[PDB]
Design an enzyme around this catalytic site. Structure first.
Site, PDB file in Angstrom:
ATOM      1  N   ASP A 142     -11.554  -7.029   3.228  1.00 22.75           N
ATOM      2  CA  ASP A 142     -11.891  -6.789   4.629  1.00 22.75           C
ATOM      3  C   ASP A 142     -13.194  -7.493   4.975  1.00 22.75           C
ATOM      4  O   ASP A 142     -14.232  -7.207   4.370  1.00 22.75           O
ATOM      5  CB  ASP A 142     -12.009  -5.286   4.927  1.00 22.75           C
ATOM      6  CG  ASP A 142     -12.252  -4.994   6.412  1.00 22.75           C
ATOM      7  OD1 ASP A 142     -11.646  -5.671   7.272  1.00 22.75           O
ATOM      8  OD2 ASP A 142     -13.030  -4.068   6.727  1.00 22.75           O
ATOM      9  N   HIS A 214      -0.929  -7.081  11.379  1.00 26.53           N
ATOM     10  CA  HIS A 214      -2.249  -6.774  11.902  1.00 26.53           C
ATOM     11  C   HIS A 214      -2.904  -8.012  12.507  1.00 26.53           C
ATOM     12  O   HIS A 214      -3.406  -7.983  13.635  1.00 26.53           O
ATOM     13  CB  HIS A 214      -3.107  -6.181  10.787  1.00 26.53           C
ATOM     14  CG  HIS A 214      -4.455  -5.765  11.255  1.00 26.53           C
ATOM     15  ND1 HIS A 214      -4.648  -5.140  12.468  1.00 26.53           N
ATOM     16  CD2 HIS A 214      -5.681  -5.906  10.701  1.00 26.53           C
ATOM     17  CE1 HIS A 214      -5.933  -4.897  12.634  1.00 26.53           C
ATOM     18  NE2 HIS A 214      -6.581  -5.353  11.578  1.00 26.53           N
TER      19      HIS A 214
END
Ligand code: HEM
Ligand code: HEM
Lengths: 298, 298
Positions: A142, A214
């Site tokens: 991330d 996403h």
């Protein structure tokens, strides 16, 4: 007009987020913020080792009263998106402390409670930690495409001119991961859910991945240029109990954040983010972070 | 016989403690412990510089079952001390993880849960952190007279020979600090409470400090020789909610620990530890950590 110190630093190891409501007169916050800002500068000088920064930000009603209704025209109460799929917990005050040292962070958090304690009631306190290889607890890295370097992050996150110069809009949203549901998925399934390969962390081209992935949900453009945000999210929780991602984003415009939320939660095109297969948001709120100069002289 | 890796490392930055009860068949733990230790060995090789270590320890009834009554004759259920001052929350399984890195600890804890999850129900999970200058949240340096070096610590904490060679006795006790009550005391009064000076962390002569002082309570001797323990306690909690010290001690003999408890909580000479003016224990359990050989050989 000086930015608050916690927006621009990169690659913190630990963070603390405190969300709180005003109890009593909102005007007490003026003096609280000045007291805390002074304690914060002291800690920054005492522990340059920590690369410490912090942000104080305010919700719509509270900032409207503190600013006298001037500026921050985009600011509004966070309200539910996706017909409730993204719930709303709009509080009055957000304090975000981040650095390379959780021990320093805790000292700064105690100073925040001392400065604000009589004026607010704390509703949430989350201690974020960077995990191995900067991965989300799902096992995906991330932060890769986060804006990098002071110049670009300042462009994305810090209001450049006007009455609000040096301020920023903040979005916070706590997510709860169901890792057992994640692990029922094949790695290929997971990778199609995110838009990048899991271990190698390479992007899957927009045509190879489903529109619910996403990355497809949040890769939005206006006038052909991507709507960027500066994410300070970290993992949180316990191994045996609740755990997930404390999502946190700064942006010079609330629009870029809201557009990604509308996209992720089905409002814009009816499709929802595929990550909702294994994780869900349980809080949400919008805040305005003034410049440090404005914070010091409320 | 090999000691479990979590007992001897000094100056960890962070720890995770998990207390749990057996859910189904206690014999399921045999395969659970082997699986986890295998996983732990892998993290110790993958993170050779983190000083990672972990301990699996067992309550009285669960250990008796696992060991067929053999050895650990001192092991017993933890029961209240000081007429309820120190409550008892005896569970079946204790997992203690420590290192220089919280992110690595969290991976190890997730592995512990992947391995023990089906067989146990977690009662508590606590994340400890070293605070600034290795001070307890009260502001006093914690650990100064702890045994230092692998030789001295092994003498105190690791059982030397017999059926239980390589093992240790563990005591965990979570305390809740009321720092408001602390900060109402003068610094002098706090120093008389602990037995060391606060900022400088210098000893106060036993004759110049109350017999209720912490140091007088816990610095005990039998037959002219000090009853040492190896402490691994760390601060825990949130700035706005519950916080304090997660107390953790390893000793070759349960007797050294129990004697200090009897002293601190008024059972020995009717005098109680002066720290009870501001903090209190809310959990307590005794566990037996077998040597790493038995843990794999269950
Ligand atoms: C409202 C919530 C969220 C928003 C607005 C958001 C926004 C973004 C944005 C703008 C990107 C960069 C996309 C690009 O240009 O390549 C991104 C990437 C990513 N996000 Fe999210 N995100 C959210 C929640 C989450 C959650 C809950 C997770 C994980 C559980 C997550 C995991 C990732 C990953 C793994 C990446 C790819 C690596 C990276 O570029 O950072 N995000 N997100
Ligand atoms: C709120 C809980 C506690 C706090 C804040 C605390 C704090 C301290 C401090 C500040 C010291 C002096 C510095 C050092 O040498 O480490 C100390 C020493 C020590 N403590 Fe505690 N302690 C707590 C609970 C306990 C308990 C429950 C035990 C034993 C059952 C214990 C056993 C000891 C021992 C053996 C020493 C070394 C004394 C010496 O030889 O000088 N402590 N503790």
């Amino acid at each position: 007009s000086q930015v608050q110190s916690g927006i621009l630093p990169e690659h913190c190891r630990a963070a603390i987020w405190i969300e709180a409501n005003v109890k009593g007169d909102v005007n007490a916050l003026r003096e609280c913020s000045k007291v805390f800002a002074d304690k914060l500068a002291g800690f920054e000088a005492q522990f340059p080792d920590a690369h410490l920064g912090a942000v104080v930000a305010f919700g719509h009603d509270t900032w409207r009263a503190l600013s006298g209704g001037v500026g921050a025209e985009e600011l509004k109460d966070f309200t539910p998106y996706g017909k409730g799929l993204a719930p709303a917990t709009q509080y009055d005050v957000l304090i975000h402390i981040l650095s390379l040292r959780h021990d320093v962070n805790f000292s700064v958090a105690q100073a925040a409670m001392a400065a604000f304690g009589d004026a607010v009631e704390v509703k949430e306190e989350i201690h974020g930690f960077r995990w191995v290889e900067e991965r989300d607890l799902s096992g995906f890295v991330d932060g890769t495409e986060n804006p990098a370097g002071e110049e670009t992050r300042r462009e994305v996150a810090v209001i450049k001119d006007g009455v609000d110069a040096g301020g920023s809009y903040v979005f916070v949203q706590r997510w709860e991961h169901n890792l057992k549901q994640l692990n029922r998925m094949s790695v290929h399934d997971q990778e199609m859910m995110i838009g990048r390969t899991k271990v190698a962390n390479e992007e899957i081209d927009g045509d190879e991945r489903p529109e619910t992935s996403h990355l497809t949900r949040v890769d939005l453009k206006e006038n052909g240029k991507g709507l960027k945000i500066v994410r300070q999210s970290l993992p949180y929780g316990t191994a045996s109990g609740t755990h997930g991602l404390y999502f946190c984003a700064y942006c010079a415009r609330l629009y870029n954040i809201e557009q990604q939320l509308l996209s992720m939660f089905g409002d814009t095109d009816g499709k929802r983010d595929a990550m909702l297969r294994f994780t869900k948001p349980v809080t949400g709120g919008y805040y305005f972070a003034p410049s440090l100069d404005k914070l010091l002289a409320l």
